[PDB]
Amino acid sequence: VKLAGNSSLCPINGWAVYSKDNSIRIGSKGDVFVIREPFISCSHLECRTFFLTQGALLNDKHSNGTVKDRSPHRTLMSCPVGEAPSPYNSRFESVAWSASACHDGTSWLTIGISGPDNGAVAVLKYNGIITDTIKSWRNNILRTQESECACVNGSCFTVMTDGPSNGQASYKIFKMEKGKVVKSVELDAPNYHYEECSCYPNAGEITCVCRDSWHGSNRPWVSFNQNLEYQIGYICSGVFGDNPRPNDGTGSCGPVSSNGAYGVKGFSFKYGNGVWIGRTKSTNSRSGFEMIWDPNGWTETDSSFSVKQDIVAITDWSGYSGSFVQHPELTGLDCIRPCFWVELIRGRPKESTIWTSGSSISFCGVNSDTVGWSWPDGAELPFTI
Amino acid sequence: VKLAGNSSLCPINGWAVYSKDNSIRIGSKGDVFVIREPFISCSHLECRTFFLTQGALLNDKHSNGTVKDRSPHRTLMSCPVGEAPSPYNSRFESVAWSASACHDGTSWLTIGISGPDNGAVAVLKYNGIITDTIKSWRNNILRTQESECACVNGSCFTVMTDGPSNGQASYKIFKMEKGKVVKSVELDAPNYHYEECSCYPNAGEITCVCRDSWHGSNRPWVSFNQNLEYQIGYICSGVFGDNPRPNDGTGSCGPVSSNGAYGVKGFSFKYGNGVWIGRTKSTNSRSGFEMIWDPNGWTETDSSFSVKQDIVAITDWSGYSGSFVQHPELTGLDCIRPCFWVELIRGRPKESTIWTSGSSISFCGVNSDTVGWSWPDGAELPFTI
Amino acid sequence: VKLAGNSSLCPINGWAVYSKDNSIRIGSKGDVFVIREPFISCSHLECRTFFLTQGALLNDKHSNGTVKDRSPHRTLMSCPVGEAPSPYNSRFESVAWSASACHDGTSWLTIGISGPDNGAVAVLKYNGIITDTIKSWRNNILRTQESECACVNGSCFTVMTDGPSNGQASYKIFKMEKGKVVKSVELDAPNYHYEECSCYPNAGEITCVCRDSWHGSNRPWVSFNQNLEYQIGYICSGVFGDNPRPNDGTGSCGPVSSNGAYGVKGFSFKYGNGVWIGRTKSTNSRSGFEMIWDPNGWTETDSSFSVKQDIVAITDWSGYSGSFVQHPELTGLDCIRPCFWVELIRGRPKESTIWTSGSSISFCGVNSDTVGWSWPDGAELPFTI
Amino acid sequence: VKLAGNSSLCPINGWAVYSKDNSIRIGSKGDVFVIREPFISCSHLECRTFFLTQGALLNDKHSNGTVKDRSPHRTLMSCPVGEAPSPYNSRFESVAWSASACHDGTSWLTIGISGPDNGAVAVLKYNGIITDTIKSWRNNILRTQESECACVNGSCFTVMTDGPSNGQASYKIFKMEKGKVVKSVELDAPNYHYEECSCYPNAGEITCVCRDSWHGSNRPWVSFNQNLEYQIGYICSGVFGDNPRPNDGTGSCGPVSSNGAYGVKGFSFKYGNGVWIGRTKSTNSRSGFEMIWDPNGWTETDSSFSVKQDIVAITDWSGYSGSFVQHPELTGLDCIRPCFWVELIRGRPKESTIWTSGSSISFCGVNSDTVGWSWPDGAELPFTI
Ligand SMILES: CCC(CC)O[C@@H]1C=C(C(=O)O)C[C@H](N)[C@H]1NC(C)=O
Ligand SMILES: CCC(CC)O[C@@H]1C=C(C(=O)O)C[C@H](N)[C@H]1NC(C)=O
């Protein structure tokens, strides 16, 4: 039976550790894929980590230049949360250098993009058999969430971008059923820029918080109806959510151009006019991670917030982060539990290795008590190479 | 319930990437079988890659001389599509240096040939228990498809050859039910030569496109009734399908002897008088791969075609290719989806290693949009040896 | 359906070997987690070994200083009994440097503690989704059983300590249902000290035998009602159960301070006024292991006992040990079968390696005949390092 | 539902290859257990290979002196037929240096013997939970089949020996239900000697062909009722079954002492007064293997036989062999299919390594055509050591 997405986000107080996979530490000896862009997504029965392999293993020569990003060897695979991604425990999903996936209550939808920069095509699979295809409509690196899509009442939604990461690009919302696109809409968002959206269901509607890699130090958002009727904006808070970014100060309801140029995938959870913001601790690089609660922060410019919970110390590398959700049909709860994962990137460009890969940690909503700490990657580089 | 094969091939426009296993890249460190002659076959629930191991692992001494072809250690094993074939994820099927397999909707039929060149015997298994046996009737390397057999209405069909690869040989069609041969027929095809057939069901009948390793640059075919009443011919198109082959030109409805001598396993899909042709890009060696659509190409000698889609660049090694199909009982479709796989051979004779092995890619039918690219093997040789 | 804990312990005569995992021997080449604090726990269908990984593999550099105890990379994972714990066969459970788990007949409850010494928090999961949380209430290394909790009539019970291991600390019993704490009680036990309790169900009540790491050479106990109404005491027998300890002699019904200072996790089974005692063979170090039956030994100070069964020779390293139970709903028996496991610690501080890890053995109750022997770890150190 | 053993052996003509695991070849690089005493046994759904590990991996130092035989680290494990036995695919069964196992239609019965030579004890498990125990009754290496037990109508039967392998010993038949011994009988067989019996069901009764390691070049047998009413004898044929043995000649209905001293585990199938005999090709050592059909050979002394099928060349090492059966409830047949496996021993004492281990091949009954060949181990020694 299909996931009803009619319920609202769970009220929460802080974040409880959910998983840590230690995949790079383990990979020093074990047979662990070099990966990046990991994300977690759940069905009504299980939780899985998806990731983009480099079609190679840690500490092997084929991991050379894995800083690259796009290649024909890149594949989307998945394994159970918290396990190191290995050829011996990973299920193959799709050939892809950009991806998304989600479960609608019946089976898995995977979205894997491969092909040339000037004509990439997204292959959609429902339960592993191809059900549809979406070709680049601007010939400029068709790309998608790098985190789970969102399902409501048996329809699933994702966001894709085609165009320069460097300026105005084209942004589309897709609605799909049984892995087939049944409707799409191009956002009319001049001066906005959406990339790598973290989307979640909430009371029958989808809310996406994304990355402005053009000129936004705060994060852009799109929420929409099951009919793809949408609204757009940026997060107003002066607690800036992107990286790089300026020191906290007076924010804006539109793209804060100061330091907004490059960005990193992130997420945020909206509760009334407040936001739970996940962000790096560093202002310049992808270091540290922290959760911040600014009530009156989705709509106001206060650079002030109520609660801060440490996730990774400023002294340790982080990377991407994204939302994922646990539905009542899995949980037994009367609401939709907000969770998030963090990618811990090791290797190039920040360190002197021939390779780049990521570990993951994740945390879940929770109304009971919690604590801040540092759960860093933990591997010691360089490797045997 | 048994696969009805009564449906016709799906109308398609191009080919969507389905899988890539990266098995040789992974096998540089991981515990991956050295294999060749991989192929994909599906049931009503799953898709699996079958392959002929060399009873050894990449980058280990026992992979020496794995160019050989036939030995007592060769075994037919299988794993889920897209995973690297490893002793930790592979199901054992049969002792074999030539093989076929297919699912009838109820359980797997595997066909594994082993024994001496002068008296090989094919062991047939239904659901893993031996159900029948077929002995070499010409004492000269009994051998079979190296790709999936074809099932219709609870009967499965394969093709076998016994005799010289070098000249006239003997060709048989087998009909089997629950893994027992219930009828067979020797083709009366003087001047023809069939090897390594790719067979698929279409509207209650089987169509096989094969390899002429005697004197055919174009590909031989055999289609037949559930009663083993058959027709034979070659593909007429001047877009020659085999490798080696001459440059495209005026073809023939019989064996084009020019350059036809050695050959490579291949496939083709027939749509009316048109063909989807999969072939190497190179004329002299197993390099590159491409899909070509020549309407009026199954029956005519036009060296002209309508559409070409790149699969592997001319700069990269390929190898065998074969058809595989996805039935409605797995797909939900109202037709039989055509797919294909390509074997990417690395090592000897083309490269300076002690071993030979293959990776795989696969693609599926699809009525939506697609793109050409190059999805090559990607390993860098030689290995630690 | 929920495990009824209403049955009594099975009458037994000795102990039959149940499992041995050889994980350190295997780990000399294979990909085996460096672990410690293993334990076994069963459901109505299966038995699993849980363990605290160090987020690293044997014989790899990341196994350096794994003597440490508490770190952010420590995780609680599980695999089927008797298998070497590996990233390829282990299920991830929780991020944790202290843990417990148990199955209530419906699904698994896992308890994983992580965070800073001064504010650790226990994350409770039911069927893998977080259901509750318990924060350190004394800011001094919140910690728990390192062996299975106990379930009766759909409620599960565990014991936790917070405070100095060195003196008076605080001890709590928790009652939980579907992974949520529904009642707790702080023991009023001045001069007592409880750590690393081995708890088991017996006739609808829980009995825990624990470790006095303050001033007890004999073992402390707590038994309690489903209402958390409890009784406390020590094991009276002059066959002292802890390590270190004095030579056997006249015991006491309260903490025997002579040599009682440091301790080791252990267990015991109570039958009327008799005890089955598992203990090291050595008086000074964690060497050897043996099962001893002192009837009139739970309540009397006799240093005399009826039966002794050798489990590990004095010549070989041992370590922790703990109880685990097999319920009638798994067994078909009319009683609750007592079993136990032993941790065989190799490496630092006793041996000259950079690492520390453990193997396990386990034995089951049994009314038929048995024998004593020595089933030691078996690895030969140091390793390649 | 329980396996009815009421059916008779299938009529057969020869032997079709069923499996080959290549475990030593693969083990040169992969993580493969060093093992010996492998055997195959089937349920109503699957076939598994059981084996006695040495608690160590090929090509690792812990494989030193694995010629030994009995140690506390020896464990009985299992994996699907044809796969290399590895810590990543093997199910743990029992701690054991001698073993048997079989499935009764409902679940697995495993028998694992461990402990000291002077008091070994067999642990019986049904579905993995201990159900009974059998202690050495002569204090001289209690030991059992090293091949599958036999099940009929929900009862399972095995044979054990206690005493000298060197002279008169004590032999017992055990009947068990749900893994509990419900009856046993000591054979009154002065001058006979039974070891390592291969037992199979046939028309509601069990037939065992065994090893006389005292003074028998021909093989001893015991057949018996479900009531443990038994008959004994030796195989009369002058085609001697054991190894070592004399050249074929005039045989005897009793122990043929010439060359009968040491022996090897073997099997034979009885069809009326004829036998299918599996034996080494060599007369002096465990080299080669072959199947021979002597009708009028179970009861007569003719050194003449009708059919011989080669299994392993005289030039290659063999070892133990044993029967295994496939019941109608798994097969769909109206009879009980005879199969057999062969252990291919590599290393000490015959070769210059520090270790000893075995590969396996297996073959099944079959009424269709077959061929003889040589399917040898294939590993090249010595290893990296
Ligand atoms: C192509 C622009 C895009 C968004 C800025 O770059 C992303 C940045 C990345 C990064 O900043 O870490 C790595 C992502 N894999 C890449 N996405 C793709 C499809 O290559
Ligand atoms: C024996 C002739 C046959 C068909 C030409 O050769 C095949 C060619 C092969 C090839 O051209 O790649 C490799 C196949 N493994 C081989 N088949 C067997 C059974 O050896």
Ligand SMILES: CCC(CC)O[C@@H]1C=C(C(=O)O)C[C@H](N)[C@H]1NC(C)=O
């Ligand atoms: C913190 C006191 C506690 C009980 C004495 O120490 C335990 C002793 C240990 C030991 O004696 O082996 C190692 C355990 N990992 C440790 N537990 C934790 C959470 O650190």
Ligand SMILES: CCC(CC)O[C@@H]1C=C(C(=O)O)C[C@H](N)[C@H]1NC(C)=O
């Ligand atoms: C102890 C006598 C017994 C039968 C002769 O020896 C067997 C011979 C063996 C052999 O001849 O190969 C190895 C077996 N593992 C061994 N069985 C045990 C329990 O040690």
